Amino acid sequence: LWINKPWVHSLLRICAIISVISVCMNTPMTFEHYPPLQYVTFTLDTLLMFLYTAEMIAKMHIRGI
C-alpha cells in the first residue's frame, strides 16, 4: 500500500545506512571530541527508531505474529 512504494524501500535502506553511520559515531572519545555529535546521533537514532517501529507495526497489521 502506501508503505509499499517502489522508492520507500530505498528510503528505508538509506535510513539503515544512516543508522550504521550513527552507531559508528557513538564512542566516548568521539563524544568528548564533539558533544554536538552526541546530540546529533541521539536525534538520528530517535528518528530511525520511530520510523522503524512505525513500519514494523504497519507490516504486522497484515501478517500474523
Side-chain angles (χ1 to χ4, degrees), residues 1 3-62 64-65:
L1 237 183
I3 69 170
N4 292 336
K5 294 177 179 58
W7 61 270
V8 74
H9 297 2
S10 64
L11 177 57
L12 300 185
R13 298 184 300 103
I14 296 180
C15 289
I17 298 300
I18 293 179
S19 178
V20 171
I21 297 179
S22 174
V23 75
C24 291
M25 297 184 305
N26 180 278
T27 96
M29 283 298 303
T30 309
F31 289 170
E32 181 174 352
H33 284 5
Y34 323 97
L37 282 193
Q38 172 187 15
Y39 288 99
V40 162
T41 185
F42 164 73
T43 302
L44 290 181
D45 292 2
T46 300
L47 175 60
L48 294 159
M49 201 285 301
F50 192 13
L51 179 61
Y52 276 127
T53 302
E55 58 84 16
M56 182 187 66
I57 64 177
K59 180 169 300 179
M60 75 175 184
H61 260 78
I62 307 302
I65 298 180

Short mmCIF file of all heavy atoms in Angstrom, two decimals, unseen atoms left out:
data_model
loop_
_atom_site.label_atom_id
_atom_site.label_comp_id
_atom_site.label_asym_id
_atom_site.label_seq_id
_atom_site.Cartn_x
_atom_site.Cartn_y
_atom_site.Cartn_z
N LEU A 1 0.83 -1.20 0.00
CA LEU A 1 0.00 0.00 0.00
C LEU A 1 0.87 1.25 0.00
O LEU A 1 1.81 1.37 -0.78
CB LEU A 1 -0.94 0.00 1.21
CG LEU A 1 -2.44 0.10 0.91
CD1 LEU A 1 -3.23 0.18 2.20
CD2 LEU A 1 -2.74 1.30 0.02
N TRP A 2 0.53 2.20 0.88
CA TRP A 2 1.30 3.44 0.97
C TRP A 2 2.73 3.17 1.41
O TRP A 2 3.66 3.83 0.94
CB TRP A 2 0.61 4.41 1.93
N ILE A 3 2.93 2.21 2.31
CA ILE A 3 4.26 1.87 2.80
C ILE A 3 4.99 0.90 1.88
O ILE A 3 6.13 0.52 2.18
CB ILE A 3 4.20 1.28 4.22
CG1 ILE A 3 3.55 -0.10 4.18
CG2 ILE A 3 3.44 2.21 5.15
CD1 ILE A 3 3.67 -0.86 5.48
N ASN A 4 4.37 0.48 0.78
CA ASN A 4 4.99 -0.43 -0.18
C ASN A 4 5.35 0.28 -1.48
O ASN A 4 5.29 -0.32 -2.56
CB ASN A 4 4.08 -1.62 -0.45
CG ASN A 4 3.93 -2.52 0.76
OD1 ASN A 4 4.80 -2.55 1.63
ND2 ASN A 4 2.84 -3.27 0.81
N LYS A 5 5.71 1.55 -1.40
CA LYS A 5 6.13 2.29 -2.58
C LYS A 5 7.43 1.70 -3.14
O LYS A 5 8.25 1.16 -2.39
CB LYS A 5 6.33 3.76 -2.25
CG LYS A 5 5.05 4.49 -1.87
CD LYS A 5 5.33 5.93 -1.50
CE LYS A 5 4.05 6.66 -1.15
NZ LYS A 5 3.32 6.00 -0.04
N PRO A 6 7.63 1.77 -4.45
CA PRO A 6 8.89 1.27 -5.02
C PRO A 6 10.11 1.98 -4.49
O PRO A 6 11.18 1.36 -4.37
CB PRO A 6 8.71 1.51 -6.53
CG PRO A 6 7.66 2.57 -6.63
CD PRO A 6 6.73 2.32 -5.49
N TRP A 7 10.00 3.26 -4.15
CA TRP A 7 11.14 4.03 -3.66
C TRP A 7 11.21 4.13 -2.14
O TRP A 7 12.25 4.51 -1.61
CB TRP A 7 11.12 5.44 -4.25
CG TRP A 7 9.90 6.23 -3.87
CD1 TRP A 7 8.73 6.29 -4.55
CD2 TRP A 7 9.74 7.07 -2.72
NE1 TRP A 7 7.84 7.11 -3.90
CE2 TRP A 7 8.44 7.60 -2.77
CE3 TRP A 7 10.58 7.42 -1.65
CZ2 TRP A 7 7.95 8.47 -1.80
CZ3 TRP A 7 10.09 8.28 -0.69
CH2 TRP A 7 8.79 8.79 -0.77
N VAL A 8 10.12 3.81 -1.43
CA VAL A 8 10.15 3.90 0.02
C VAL A 8 11.10 2.85 0.61
O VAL A 8 11.71 3.08 1.66
CB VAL A 8 8.73 3.78 0.61
CG1 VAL A 8 8.23 2.35 0.55
CG2 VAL A 8 8.71 4.30 2.04
N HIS A 9 11.25 1.71 -0.06
CA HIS A 9 12.21 0.71 0.40
C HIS A 9 13.63 1.22 0.26
O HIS A 9 14.49 0.95 1.11
CB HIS A 9 12.02 -0.59 -0.37
CG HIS A 9 10.68 -1.23 -0.16
ND1 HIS A 9 9.70 -0.66 0.63
CD2 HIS A 9 10.15 -2.38 -0.63
CE1 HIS A 9 8.63 -1.44 0.64
NE2 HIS A 9 8.88 -2.49 -0.12
N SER A 10 13.91 1.97 -0.81
CA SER A 10 15.21 2.62 -0.93
C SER A 10 15.41 3.63 0.19
O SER A 10 16.52 3.78 0.72
CB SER A 10 15.34 3.31 -2.29
OG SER A 10 14.38 4.34 -2.43
N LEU A 11 14.35 4.34 0.58
CA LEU A 11 14.43 5.24 1.72
C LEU A 11 14.77 4.48 2.99
O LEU A 11 15.59 4.94 3.80
CB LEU A 11 13.12 6.00 1.87
CG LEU A 11 13.02 6.94 3.08
CD1 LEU A 11 14.13 7.97 3.05
CD2 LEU A 11 11.66 7.62 3.11
N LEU A 12 14.16 3.31 3.18
CA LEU A 12 14.47 2.50 4.36
C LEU A 12 15.91 2.02 4.34
O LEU A 12 16.57 1.97 5.38
CB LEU A 12 13.50 1.32 4.45
CG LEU A 12 12.03 1.72 4.56
CD1 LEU A 12 11.15 0.49 4.77
CD2 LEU A 12 11.83 2.73 5.67
N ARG A 13 16.42 1.65 3.16
CA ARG A 13 17.81 1.23 3.06
C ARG A 13 18.76 2.38 3.39
O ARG A 13 19.77 2.19 4.09
CB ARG A 13 18.10 0.68 1.67
CG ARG A 13 17.30 -0.56 1.31
CD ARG A 13 17.70 -1.11 -0.05
NE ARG A 13 17.50 -0.15 -1.13
CZ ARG A 13 18.47 0.55 -1.70
NH1 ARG A 13 19.73 0.42 -1.32
NH2 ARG A 13 18.17 1.40 -2.67
N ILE A 14 18.46 3.58 2.89
CA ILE A 14 19.28 4.74 3.21
C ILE A 14 19.22 5.03 4.71
O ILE A 14 20.22 5.40 5.33
CB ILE A 14 18.84 5.96 2.37
CG1 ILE A 14 19.08 5.69 0.89
CG2 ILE A 14 19.59 7.21 2.81
CD1 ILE A 14 18.68 6.84 -0.01
N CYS A 15 18.04 4.86 5.30
CA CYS A 15 17.91 5.03 6.75
C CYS A 15 18.75 4.01 7.51
O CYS A 15 19.34 4.33 8.54
CB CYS A 15 16.44 4.92 7.15
SG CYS A 15 15.42 6.33 6.63
N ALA A 16 18.79 2.77 7.01
CA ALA A 16 19.63 1.76 7.64
C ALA A 16 21.11 2.14 7.56
O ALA A 16 21.86 1.96 8.52
CB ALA A 16 19.39 0.40 6.99
N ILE A 17 21.53 2.66 6.41
CA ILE A 17 22.91 3.13 6.28
C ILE A 17 23.18 4.26 7.26
O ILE A 17 24.25 4.34 7.88
CB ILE A 17 23.20 3.55 4.83
CG1 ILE A 17 23.05 2.35 3.89
CG2 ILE A 17 24.59 4.15 4.71
CD1 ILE A 17 23.99 1.21 4.21
N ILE A 18 22.21 5.17 7.42
CA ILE A 18 22.35 6.27 8.36
C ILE A 18 22.47 5.73 9.79
O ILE A 18 23.25 6.25 10.59
CB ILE A 18 21.17 7.24 8.22
CG1 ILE A 18 21.22 7.95 6.87
CG2 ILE A 18 21.17 8.26 9.35
CD1 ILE A 18 20.07 8.91 6.64
N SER A 19 21.69 4.71 10.12
CA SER A 19 21.79 4.09 11.44
C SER A 19 23.16 3.47 11.66
O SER A 19 23.73 3.56 12.75
CB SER A 19 20.70 3.04 11.61
OG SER A 19 20.80 2.40 12.87
N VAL A 20 23.70 2.82 10.63
CA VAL A 20 25.05 2.26 10.72
C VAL A 20 26.06 3.37 10.99
O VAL A 20 26.94 3.24 11.85
CB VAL A 20 25.39 1.47 9.45
CG1 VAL A 20 26.86 1.08 9.45
CG2 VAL A 20 24.51 0.24 9.34
N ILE A 21 25.94 4.48 10.26
CA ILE A 21 26.85 5.60 10.48
C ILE A 21 26.73 6.13 11.90
O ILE A 21 27.73 6.38 12.58
CB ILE A 21 26.59 6.71 9.44
CG1 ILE A 21 26.88 6.19 8.03
CG2 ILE A 21 27.44 7.93 9.74
CD1 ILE A 21 26.62 7.21 6.94
N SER A 22 25.49 6.29 12.38
CA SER A 22 25.28 6.83 13.72
C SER A 22 25.87 5.91 14.78
O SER A 22 26.52 6.39 15.72
CB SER A 22 23.79 7.04 13.96
OG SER A 22 23.55 7.44 15.30
N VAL A 23 25.65 4.60 14.66
CA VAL A 23 26.20 3.69 15.65
C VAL A 23 27.71 3.63 15.54
O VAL A 23 28.40 3.36 16.53
CB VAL A 23 25.55 2.29 15.53
CG1 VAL A 23 26.09 1.54 14.32
CG2 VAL A 23 25.76 1.49 16.80
N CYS A 24 28.26 3.88 14.35
CA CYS A 24 29.71 4.04 14.23
C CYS A 24 30.19 5.34 14.85
O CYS A 24 31.39 5.46 15.14
CB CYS A 24 30.13 3.97 12.76
SG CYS A 24 29.95 2.35 11.99
N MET A 25 29.30 6.31 15.04
CA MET A 25 29.64 7.59 15.65
C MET A 25 29.18 7.66 17.10
O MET A 25 28.75 8.72 17.57
CB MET A 25 29.05 8.74 14.85
CG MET A 25 29.58 8.84 13.43
SD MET A 25 28.94 10.29 12.57
CE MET A 25 27.18 10.05 12.76
N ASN A 26 29.26 6.55 17.84
CA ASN A 26 28.87 6.50 19.25
C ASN A 26 30.04 5.92 20.04
O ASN A 26 30.09 4.71 20.30
CB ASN A 26 27.59 5.68 19.43
CG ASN A 26 27.15 5.60 20.88
OD1 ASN A 26 27.64 4.78 21.65
ND2 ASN A 26 26.19 6.45 21.25
N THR A 27 30.99 6.77 20.41
CA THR A 27 32.14 6.39 21.21
C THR A 27 32.34 7.45 22.29
O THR A 27 32.00 8.62 22.09
CB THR A 27 33.43 6.27 20.39
OG1 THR A 27 34.17 7.49 20.47
CG2 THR A 27 33.12 5.97 18.93
N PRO A 28 32.90 7.06 23.44
CA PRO A 28 33.23 8.08 24.46
C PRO A 28 34.22 9.11 23.97
O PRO A 28 34.08 10.30 24.27
CB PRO A 28 33.78 7.24 25.62
CG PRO A 28 34.23 5.96 24.99
CD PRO A 28 33.26 5.70 23.88
N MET A 29 35.23 8.69 23.21
CA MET A 29 36.21 9.64 22.69
C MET A 29 35.59 10.58 21.67
O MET A 29 35.87 11.79 21.68
CB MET A 29 37.40 8.89 22.08
CG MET A 29 38.36 8.33 23.10
SD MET A 29 39.11 9.64 24.10
CE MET A 29 39.85 10.64 22.81
N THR A 30 34.74 10.06 20.79
CA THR A 30 34.08 10.91 19.81
C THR A 30 33.16 11.91 20.49
O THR A 30 33.13 13.09 20.13
CB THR A 30 33.29 10.06 18.81
OG1 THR A 30 34.14 9.03 18.29
CG2 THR A 30 32.78 10.92 17.67
N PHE A 31 32.40 11.46 21.50
CA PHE A 31 31.52 12.37 22.22
C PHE A 31 32.31 13.43 22.98
O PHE A 31 31.90 14.59 23.04
CB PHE A 31 30.63 11.58 23.18
CG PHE A 31 29.57 10.77 22.49
CD1 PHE A 31 28.81 9.85 23.20
CD2 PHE A 31 29.32 10.94 21.14
CE1 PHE A 31 27.84 9.11 22.57
CE2 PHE A 31 28.34 10.20 20.51
CZ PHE A 31 27.60 9.28 21.22
N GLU A 32 33.45 13.04 23.55
CA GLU A 32 34.31 14.03 24.19
C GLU A 32 34.82 15.04 23.17
O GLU A 32 34.92 16.24 23.47
CB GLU A 32 35.48 13.34 24.89
CG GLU A 32 36.42 14.29 25.60
CD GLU A 32 37.48 13.56 26.42
OE1 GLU A 32 37.38 12.32 26.55
OE2 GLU A 32 38.40 14.23 26.93
N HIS A 33 35.15 14.58 21.97
CA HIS A 33 35.59 15.49 20.92
C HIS A 33 34.48 16.44 20.50
O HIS A 33 34.70 17.65 20.35
CB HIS A 33 36.10 14.70 19.71
CG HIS A 33 37.46 14.10 19.90
ND1 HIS A 33 38.13 14.17 21.10
CD2 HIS A 33 38.27 13.44 19.05
CE1 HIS A 33 39.30 13.57 20.98
NE2 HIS A 33 39.41 13.12 19.74
N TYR A 34 33.27 15.92 20.31
CA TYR A 34 32.14 16.72 19.86
C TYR A 34 30.86 16.25 20.53
O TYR A 34 30.20 15.32 20.06
CB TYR A 34 31.98 16.67 18.34
CG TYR A 34 33.28 16.63 17.56
CD1 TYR A 34 33.80 15.43 17.11
CD2 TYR A 34 33.98 17.80 17.27
CE1 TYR A 34 34.98 15.38 16.39
CE2 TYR A 34 35.16 17.76 16.56
CZ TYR A 34 35.65 16.55 16.12
OH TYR A 34 36.83 16.50 15.41
N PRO A 35 30.49 16.86 21.65
CA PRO A 35 29.16 16.60 22.24
C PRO A 35 28.03 16.95 21.28
O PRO A 35 26.96 16.32 21.33
CB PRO A 35 29.14 17.51 23.48
CG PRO A 35 30.59 17.64 23.85
CD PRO A 35 31.35 17.65 22.55
N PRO A 36 28.20 17.95 20.39
CA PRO A 36 27.20 18.11 19.33
C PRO A 36 26.99 16.85 18.51
O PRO A 36 25.86 16.57 18.11
CB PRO A 36 27.78 19.25 18.49
CG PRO A 36 28.46 20.10 19.48
CD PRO A 36 29.05 19.15 20.49
N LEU A 37 28.05 16.08 18.24
CA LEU A 37 27.86 14.80 17.58
C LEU A 37 27.03 13.85 18.44
O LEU A 37 26.26 13.05 17.90
CB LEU A 37 29.21 14.17 17.24
CG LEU A 37 29.92 14.72 16.00
CD1 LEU A 37 31.06 13.81 15.59
CD2 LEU A 37 28.94 14.91 14.85
N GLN A 38 27.18 13.92 19.76
CA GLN A 38 26.36 13.10 20.65
C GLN A 38 24.88 13.45 20.49
O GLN A 38 24.03 12.56 20.35
CB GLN A 38 26.81 13.29 22.09
CG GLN A 38 25.92 12.64 23.13
CD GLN A 38 26.33 13.00 24.54
OE1 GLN A 38 27.10 13.95 24.75
NE2 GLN A 38 25.83 12.26 25.52
N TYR A 39 24.57 14.74 20.50
CA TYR A 39 23.18 15.15 20.29
C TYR A 39 22.68 14.72 18.92
O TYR A 39 21.54 14.26 18.77
CB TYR A 39 23.04 16.66 20.47
CG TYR A 39 23.16 17.13 21.90
CD1 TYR A 39 24.35 17.64 22.38
CD2 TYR A 39 22.08 17.06 22.77
CE1 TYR A 39 24.47 18.08 23.69
CE2 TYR A 39 22.19 17.48 24.08
CZ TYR A 39 23.38 17.99 24.53
OH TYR A 39 23.49 18.42 25.84
N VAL A 40 23.52 14.88 17.89
CA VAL A 40 23.12 14.55 16.53
C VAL A 40 22.81 13.06 16.41
O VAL A 40 21.80 12.67 15.82
CB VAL A 40 24.20 14.98 15.53
CG1 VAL A 40 24.01 14.28 14.20
CG2 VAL A 40 24.17 16.49 15.34
N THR A 41 23.68 12.21 16.96
CA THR A 41 23.43 10.78 16.86
C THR A 41 22.23 10.36 17.70
O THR A 41 21.50 9.45 17.30
CB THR A 41 24.68 9.98 17.26
OG1 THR A 41 24.44 8.58 17.04
CG2 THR A 41 25.05 10.19 18.71
N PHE A 42 21.99 11.03 18.83
CA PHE A 42 20.77 10.73 19.59
C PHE A 42 19.53 11.05 18.77
O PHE A 42 18.58 10.26 18.72
CB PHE A 42 20.75 11.51 20.90
CG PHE A 42 19.39 11.55 21.53
CD1 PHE A 42 18.87 10.43 22.15
CD2 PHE A 42 18.63 12.71 21.50
CE1 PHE A 42 17.62 10.46 22.73
CE2 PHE A 42 17.38 12.75 22.08
CZ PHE A 42 16.87 11.62 22.70
N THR A 43 19.52 12.22 18.12
CA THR A 43 18.36 12.60 17.31
C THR A 43 18.18 11.66 16.13
O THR A 43 17.05 11.26 15.81
CB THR A 43 18.50 14.04 16.84
OG1 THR A 43 18.63 14.90 17.97
CG2 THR A 43 17.28 14.45 16.03
N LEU A 44 19.28 11.29 15.47
CA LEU A 44 19.19 10.35 14.36
C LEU A 44 18.64 9.01 14.82
O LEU A 44 17.77 8.43 14.16
CB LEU A 44 20.56 10.18 13.70
CG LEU A 44 21.10 11.37 12.92
CD1 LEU A 44 22.45 11.03 12.31
CD2 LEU A 44 20.12 11.81 11.85
N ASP A 45 19.14 8.50 15.95
CA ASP A 45 18.65 7.23 16.46
C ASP A 45 17.17 7.32 16.83
O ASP A 45 16.42 6.37 16.58
CB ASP A 45 19.48 6.80 17.67
CG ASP A 45 20.90 6.44 17.30
OD1 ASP A 45 21.25 6.55 16.11
OD2 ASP A 45 21.67 6.04 18.21
N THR A 46 16.75 8.44 17.41
CA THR A 46 15.34 8.59 17.75
C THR A 46 14.47 8.57 16.51
O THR A 46 13.44 7.88 16.46
CB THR A 46 15.13 9.90 18.53
OG1 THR A 46 15.91 9.88 19.72
CG2 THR A 46 13.66 10.07 18.89
N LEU A 47 14.87 9.31 15.47
CA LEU A 47 14.09 9.34 14.24
C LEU A 47 14.04 7.96 13.59
O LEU A 47 12.98 7.51 13.14
CB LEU A 47 14.68 10.36 13.27
CG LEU A 47 14.04 10.42 11.89
CD1 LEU A 47 12.57 10.77 12.00
CD2 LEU A 47 14.77 11.41 11.00
N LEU A 48 15.18 7.27 13.55
CA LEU A 48 15.23 5.94 12.94
C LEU A 48 14.39 4.94 13.73
O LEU A 48 13.70 4.11 13.13
CB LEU A 48 16.68 5.47 12.84
CG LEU A 48 17.51 6.31 11.87
CD1 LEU A 48 18.99 6.17 12.18
CD2 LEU A 48 17.22 5.90 10.45
N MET A 49 14.45 5.00 15.06
CA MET A 49 13.64 4.11 15.87
C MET A 49 12.16 4.37 15.65
O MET A 49 11.37 3.43 15.51
CB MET A 49 14.00 4.28 17.35
CG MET A 49 13.64 3.10 18.24
SD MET A 49 11.88 2.98 18.61
CE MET A 49 11.59 4.56 19.40
N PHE A 50 11.76 5.64 15.60
CA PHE A 50 10.37 5.98 15.31
C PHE A 50 9.94 5.39 13.97
O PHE A 50 8.91 4.71 13.88
CB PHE A 50 10.20 7.50 15.33
CG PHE A 50 8.77 7.96 15.34
CD1 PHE A 50 7.73 7.07 15.59
CD2 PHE A 50 8.46 9.28 15.09
CE1 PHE A 50 6.42 7.50 15.60
CE2 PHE A 50 7.14 9.71 15.09
CZ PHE A 50 6.13 8.82 15.35
N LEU A 51 10.73 5.64 12.93
CA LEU A 51 10.36 5.16 11.60
C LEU A 51 10.29 3.65 11.54
O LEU A 51 9.36 3.08 10.96
CB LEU A 51 11.35 5.69 10.56
CG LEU A 51 11.08 5.25 9.12
CD1 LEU A 51 9.72 5.74 8.66
CD2 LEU A 51 12.18 5.74 8.19
N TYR A 52 11.27 2.97 12.14
CA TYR A 52 11.31 1.51 12.04
C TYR A 52 10.21 0.87 12.87
O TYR A 52 9.62 -0.13 12.45
CB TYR A 52 12.69 1.00 12.45
CG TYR A 52 13.68 1.04 11.32
CD1 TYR A 52 14.91 1.68 11.46
CD2 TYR A 52 13.39 0.46 10.09
CE1 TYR A 52 15.81 1.72 10.42
CE2 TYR A 52 14.28 0.49 9.05
CZ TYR A 52 15.50 1.13 9.21
OH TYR A 52 16.40 1.17 8.17
N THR A 53 9.90 1.43 14.04
CA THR A 53 8.77 0.92 14.81
C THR A 53 7.47 1.12 14.04
O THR A 53 6.62 0.22 14.00
CB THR A 53 8.70 1.62 16.16
OG1 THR A 53 9.93 1.41 16.88
CG2 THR A 53 7.54 1.07 16.99
N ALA A 54 7.30 2.28 13.41
CA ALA A 54 6.09 2.53 12.64
C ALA A 54 5.95 1.54 11.49
O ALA A 54 4.88 0.98 11.27
CB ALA A 54 6.08 3.97 12.12
N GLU A 55 7.04 1.31 10.75
CA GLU A 55 6.94 0.38 9.63
C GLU A 55 6.75 -1.05 10.11
O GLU A 55 6.05 -1.82 9.45
CB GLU A 55 8.17 0.50 8.72
CG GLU A 55 9.51 0.27 9.37
CD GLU A 55 9.89 -1.19 9.46
OE1 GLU A 55 9.26 -2.01 8.75
OE2 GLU A 55 10.81 -1.52 10.23
N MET A 56 7.35 -1.43 11.24
CA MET A 56 7.14 -2.77 11.76
C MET A 56 5.69 -2.99 12.18
O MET A 56 5.10 -4.03 11.86
CB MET A 56 8.07 -3.04 12.94
CG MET A 56 7.95 -4.44 13.51
SD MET A 56 8.90 -4.68 15.03
CE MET A 56 8.03 -3.58 16.15
N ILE A 57 5.10 -2.02 12.88
CA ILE A 57 3.71 -2.19 13.30
C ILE A 57 2.78 -2.15 12.10
O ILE A 57 1.75 -2.84 12.08
CB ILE A 57 3.32 -1.14 14.37
CG1 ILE A 57 3.37 0.28 13.80
CG2 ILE A 57 4.21 -1.27 15.59
CD1 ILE A 57 2.93 1.34 14.78
N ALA A 58 3.10 -1.34 11.08
CA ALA A 58 2.30 -1.36 9.87
C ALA A 58 2.39 -2.71 9.16
O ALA A 58 1.38 -3.24 8.69
CB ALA A 58 2.74 -0.23 8.94
N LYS A 59 3.60 -3.28 9.09
CA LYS A 59 3.78 -4.57 8.43
C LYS A 59 3.05 -5.68 9.17
O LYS A 59 2.42 -6.54 8.55
CB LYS A 59 5.27 -4.88 8.31
CG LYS A 59 5.58 -6.21 7.65
CD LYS A 59 7.06 -6.32 7.33
CE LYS A 59 7.50 -5.21 6.38
NZ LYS A 59 8.95 -5.28 6.05
N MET A 60 3.12 -5.67 10.51
CA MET A 60 2.44 -6.71 11.28
C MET A 60 0.93 -6.54 11.28
O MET A 60 0.22 -7.44 11.75
CB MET A 60 2.97 -6.74 12.71
CG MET A 60 2.47 -5.62 13.60
SD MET A 60 3.03 -5.80 15.30
CE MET A 60 2.20 -4.43 16.09
N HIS A 61 0.41 -5.41 10.78
CA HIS A 61 -1.03 -5.25 10.65
C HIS A 61 -1.64 -6.20 9.64
O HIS A 61 -2.87 -6.38 9.64
CB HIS A 61 -1.37 -3.81 10.26
CG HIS A 61 -1.81 -2.96 11.41
ND1 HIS A 61 -0.94 -2.43 12.33
CD2 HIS A 61 -3.05 -2.55 11.79
CE1 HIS A 61 -1.61 -1.73 13.23
NE2 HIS A 61 -2.89 -1.78 12.92
N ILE A 62 -0.83 -6.81 8.78
CA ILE A 62 -1.31 -7.75 7.77
C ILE A 62 -0.94 -9.19 8.14
O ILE A 62 -1.82 -10.04 8.28
CB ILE A 62 -0.78 -7.38 6.37
CG1 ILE A 62 -1.10 -5.92 6.05
CG2 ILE A 62 -1.36 -8.30 5.32
CD1 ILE A 62 -2.57 -5.60 6.11
N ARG A 63 0.35 -9.47 8.30
CA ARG A 63 0.79 -10.81 8.65
C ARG A 63 0.69 -11.04 10.15
O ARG A 63 0.89 -10.12 10.96
CB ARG A 63 2.23 -11.03 8.19
N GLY A 64 0.38 -12.28 10.52
CA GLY A 64 0.24 -12.61 11.92
C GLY A 64 1.57 -12.61 12.66
O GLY A 64 2.65 -12.66 12.07
N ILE A 65 1.47 -12.55 13.98
CA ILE A 65 2.66 -12.54 14.83
C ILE A 65 3.29 -13.92 14.87
O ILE A 65 2.60 -14.93 14.94
CB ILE A 65 2.31 -12.05 16.25
CG1 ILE A 65 1.78 -10.62 16.21
CG2 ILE A 65 3.53 -12.15 17.16
CD1 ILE A 65 1.42 -10.06 17.57
#
